[PDB]
Amino acid sequence: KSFLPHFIPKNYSYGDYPRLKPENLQKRDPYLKYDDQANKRNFNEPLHPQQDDLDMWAPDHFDFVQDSIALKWFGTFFGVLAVFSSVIYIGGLYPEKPANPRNYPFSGLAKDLGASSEEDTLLYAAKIDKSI
Amino acid sequence: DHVRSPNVSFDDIDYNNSQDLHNAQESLLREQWIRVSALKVCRKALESCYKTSGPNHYEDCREIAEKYLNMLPDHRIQGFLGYQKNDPSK
Amino acid sequence: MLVQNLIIFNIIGIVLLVLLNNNNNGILNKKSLLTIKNELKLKQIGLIISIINILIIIENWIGFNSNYYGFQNIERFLNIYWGIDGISLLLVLLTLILGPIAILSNWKNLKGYYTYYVISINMLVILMALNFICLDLVSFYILFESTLAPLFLLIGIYGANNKNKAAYYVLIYTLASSLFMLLSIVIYYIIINSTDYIYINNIILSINLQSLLFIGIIIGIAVKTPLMPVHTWLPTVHSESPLGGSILLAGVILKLAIYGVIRLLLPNLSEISMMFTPIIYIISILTLIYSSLITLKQTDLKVIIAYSSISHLAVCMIGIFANNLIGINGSLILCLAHGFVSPALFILVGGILYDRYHNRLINYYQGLSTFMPIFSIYLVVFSFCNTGTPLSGNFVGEFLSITGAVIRHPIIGSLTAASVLLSACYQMKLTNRLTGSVFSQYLHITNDVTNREIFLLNWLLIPTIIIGIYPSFVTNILNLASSTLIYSVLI
Amino acid sequence: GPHLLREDASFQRYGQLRDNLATYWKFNRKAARNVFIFLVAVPAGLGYLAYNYEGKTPFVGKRRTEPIFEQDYVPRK
Amino acid sequence: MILLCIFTPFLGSLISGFFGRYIGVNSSKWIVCLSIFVSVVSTYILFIDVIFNEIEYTYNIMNWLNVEYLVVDWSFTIDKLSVSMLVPVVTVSFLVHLYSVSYMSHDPHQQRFFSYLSMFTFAMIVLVTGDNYLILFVGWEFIGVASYLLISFWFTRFNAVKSGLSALLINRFGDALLVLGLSYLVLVTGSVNYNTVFALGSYLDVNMITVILICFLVASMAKSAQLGLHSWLLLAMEGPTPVSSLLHAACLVIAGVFLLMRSSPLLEYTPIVLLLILWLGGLSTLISGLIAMVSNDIKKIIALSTMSQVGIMMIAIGVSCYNLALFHLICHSFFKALLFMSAGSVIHSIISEYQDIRMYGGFRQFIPLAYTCIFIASLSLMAIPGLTGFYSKDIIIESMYGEYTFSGFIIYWFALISATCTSLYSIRLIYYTFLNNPNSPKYIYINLKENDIVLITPMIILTILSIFGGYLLRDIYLGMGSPFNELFIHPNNLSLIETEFSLPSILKVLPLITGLGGGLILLLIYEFNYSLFLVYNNKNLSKLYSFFNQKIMFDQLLNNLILRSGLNIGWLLNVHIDRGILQLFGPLGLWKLSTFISSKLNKLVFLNIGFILEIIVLSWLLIVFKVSLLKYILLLIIFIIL
């Protein structure tokens, strides 16, 4: 069922500060009546030293599955898509280009693409239409 | 009225003369701001050329774009401390 | 016509308040009329003094030439030369503006001794303002540390429960570090026989001696901005000092370190500043990143605001140490913008919430927009200004400082862009909590923001928006002065 | 005046603990590891990167001198 | 005309924000609607003048930044691209505002809601009309600001408050990268103006262009809720339905697409970024569709549909088909807004205001007008031939195969499955809400009625635009040779021919067969063989259902791992550094050192002749000893302090 968030210490010794079991106030029963109904807290109830990580204003904690199991599924999902992508690449099953890619006249539109002379023709031209 | 820069070079003054040194620092700074003004005017030509040319901006504004990219690395404020405290000849 | 008039008028102002209030102290058991209404007639005179101080610099501003290189309004007074340039002019105006604002913040929330508080505030404003117009290192240091004596007593008398600890922190942190800066100043007076700004800028010292001088000066500066890891005094001082003390400390004092870099490091130790720039960036980047993450775990309302100032001034240090005009101008713009938004956050926290409930713990406050809508409007607007949202002067300062950092160092200077995310993380988490959910069960319904607190928030918001939308008011004055600080030899 | 805030003892103890965590800090092996990472290891990583690429990034108006697209297409057949 | 189009929505926000108390609820809502309508009419006039007459409008208010060579002005331009973005923005905003008049009629804070709603419209107008990237950034930031105030409008609700914070902080993550990209733009080109930067794209280093547009890509993912920065999108459903209708149709969700299309002249010269955009859009399309088929909240399903459709625009950008992305963006803004409006009409029609589709059933006869709007919008979403979505979405899926590269072929399958899922969750959503056996109590059905005319009016206008809009505007954006110089397509990247002609005839109908045919199979199983979908029996099906119902566990991973660790780093910094070593090397450590040293010195001060005599005689050893031993004496003295 529920479990505490990460980085919540099991023990602490802050002098004479009371030592209480760390409780996530987000998991408390909402149908009960509290002095502070919004935060699910009664007046003068002691606070954990890291209560800011275990209250309503803390990030919402998800406890449907364990993080290791949740990360196993997350890697498995993208692992399937990775194998599916690599097989088609290594196998080379993706279709070939039906025709020669588009060609353009005037030395592959070199002058219209910022070229200055014949030295910089290949630096700016597109695929040159060799068949005039 | 429009006061003009008192052209003075660090290479023709004595730094012990605080007035001559002050003019050399001011003269170098004022020439650097003229380069920035020139750069902004040249960029205005590039902006106007790009809009009116449309798909022809590569050809119509080729020389202007080349000029802007060459002037950009050095058409900026560089200060006077660098040249005042250093002798390039040595 | 500036320093002479400013010192003489304020000294006469100090004497005038002392004569009136202390005339009947001779065990008279008297009642008197000046002390009626919490010494209203003595607070009013001190408030008028602060306003007149602003007019003094405005008269000299009319004659200021933005196209003139070098110091203007050069004046000899007390065997000291005083001058004004573009950078000094704006910082003086900010210091004097916060004068009346600091006094008005503690108008009717002090337990007594208003006359002592008023004189101390006006004395601090003038001393800090004079520190921007001195033209030598010795005069700079004299005014740099003269503010400690009025500030130490001010915190220890009008402070919060831990005022004793805060008074020790500010006195010892800022003196032990400034003494290392005095050593570098003493070295200048030994080998050059002068500490004049213009005289020492033209002298090139050995690369080893410049390293020693830079370290001595930077220790005094780094503690005062402040930078990590010498920053721990600032959260304690802000959380315990009175609201007017916090406004001056956050709005003026922390800006003296940035101005100190302009005067004491860049034009006189230019060669070693280039070498130290990677080290300064690493310290400031870690100061920015660490402070933002540390702010996420704070529970004191006023401490959260104190840490926010550390992160912003880290950007100012990064921008001011960039060797280009974009970074330098942006750092100066951010200092002016921070000089208004940061006091406003203390006013909202330590002046509005604290003056009603007297508790600075965050757990007692939530859903304040239900019965304090006017408070929440200013809190949200100033929260977005503090996070660098456009239309505010902070965004103009932060963007140019980040841009200047990238120009100075494209690789590690890019890390300064993390301030856009990190600043919104801690600032909005505080604002989202203070306005969200139902009204706090630990609070009783009371008055919203009053007219006096409305005036303080509005006239701190107005300069931020004006600078944010049209920063050319500031850039035009700074452009000629800031261009002198750049060190480069392009061939 | 009217004590508009209902002070809570648990909140005060929680607040006092947060403001005085330095009293109970111990320079153990756990603390030393965190101190080393934040104050030595992390600055060293930035320290190396800052000087490795210091003055080696001329990005102002950097020009392209290599063609982007391929001229001739080689079919897989 | 340009000034009236841009700043009129700002006037409505100011009027309701500060004068809404003095004019009442009703007049505040209509004045805001009036201000948006003025912008609507002015935009349509400009659309004819700009698109058809090839005219441009530029207004320069004043200079903003004048730091040496960096000059930025408060200037706004209306070119083909800007006015193309304005039509979805202002028109849908007006229809949402008209929709909001009757939907929010029972809310106690209507004046503030319309003030925030019109402010968002003004922020988006500034985003697409600025003539430089910094003016774009102004709208970019206030879009997140207004959305934060809209998602958390019901600030008394804890979930809405935290959801608004989630949207703001994730979008600020993109803003941090966006600032970094603009700074690099100033570093390389010394300007942020469109007319300056776009004129140097072919001459800049490819590495420099990649860094700038990688920052743009990260910023785009946050706004467009692509993979890795999409958790906030579903949390945006905490706000009122009019917010969701406006947000997910022609607003913040589409801001990421516009940024990449604006940067098309730069984006064409860094093919590696295009490869990243193509995969990021393709992955988000596949993931979003799978999640939407096991979701129960009606607004969550539509929100997931928005994420799936935005990715379709991204893959079009990834293949340099900026015209395809823009046209699908305009069409999507019309029928997706209709879905949210009609979804909010179903929630208002039911008395309990339930939002789970599992509690719906048999609404088709009771609310036929809402059903037809959903039915027509669903078919338009499913790219049914003849409708707006068919002319805008089907071509993009074809363009993946027409690219004829390895990445395009893989994304084609992802897009094909996305298209199949798009029909699958539309049929599933319709069946649960309108065709399933009733699940809600009988008392709900005897009080189930359609809403008023004011709510209906925007939906009918959108419904007609969801039938004929795409057919009329296809030639403007998808026509061959149409001049759209604002979007630059390199000659080597024009694949509109190989996509149109070389495609096998089977691929032209394959999405249709999988959509309608796959939808019929799902419909038959639900009606007659529902025992198959009792997935709580099978263990693998339960895990598979749970994995996609929890949205690829990304929300759990983001919170339990990334956000928690980021907060713990601050805790570690606070405990071990700020309150730790800096206190040992600080006031606390020096106090213990001072106490130890001063205690020793206190015992050395007492009146004793023998004590002082020995010290005086001991000092005589300094004279005797050679001075090179002073440091050894110094170490010895410290040893005695211990």
Ligand SMILES: CCCCCCCCCCCCCCCCCC(=O)OC[C@H](COP(=O)(O)OCCN)OC(=O)CCCCCCCCCCCCCCCCC
């Ligand atoms: C809540 C607290 C209160 C704060 C809220 C109000 C904040 C208002 C902020 C305004 C800041 C001042 C900006 C206007 C000052 C005038 C600027 C100026 O000096 O003129 C510049 C411009 C041409 O320059 P020039 O030829 O030199 O003329 C100078 C003649 N002496 O001359 C001009 O063209 C003048 C143009 C005046 C424009 C009027 C202001 C319009 C609104 C701001 C426009 C900014 C762009 C839109 C921002 C919205 C977001 C997109």
Ligand SMILES: CCCCCCCCCCCC(=O)OC[C@H](COP(=O)(O)OCC[N+](C)(C)C)OC(=O)CCCCCCCCCCC
């Ligand atoms: C710019 C140069 C200024 C220098 C001179 C300033 C005035 C000095 C005090 C003389 C008059 C006086 O002691 O009078 C006392 C005044 C008036 O306070 P009050 O509330 O009326 O007194 C209480 C009596 N009741 C209760 C009956 C009303 O308070 C002050 O002490 C304010 C001035 C001192 C502030 C800083 C103190 C430390 C200074 C350290 C310097 C490095």
Ligand SMILES: CCCCCCCCCCCC(=O)OC[C@H](COP(=O)(O)OCC[N+](C)(C)C)OC(=O)CCCCCCCCCCC
């Ligand atoms: C180079 C940059 C230098 C920056 C400043 C240096 C550290 C300043 C520490 C503040 C001390 C303070 O405030 O003194 C006050 C503190 C009071 O301690 P407290 O806070 O009440 O807790 C401790 C009390 N208990 C345990 C009861 C709660 O007494 C001390 O510690 C006395 C020793 C201070 C000596 C400082 C000399 C510094 C020498 C120069 C640097 C090598």
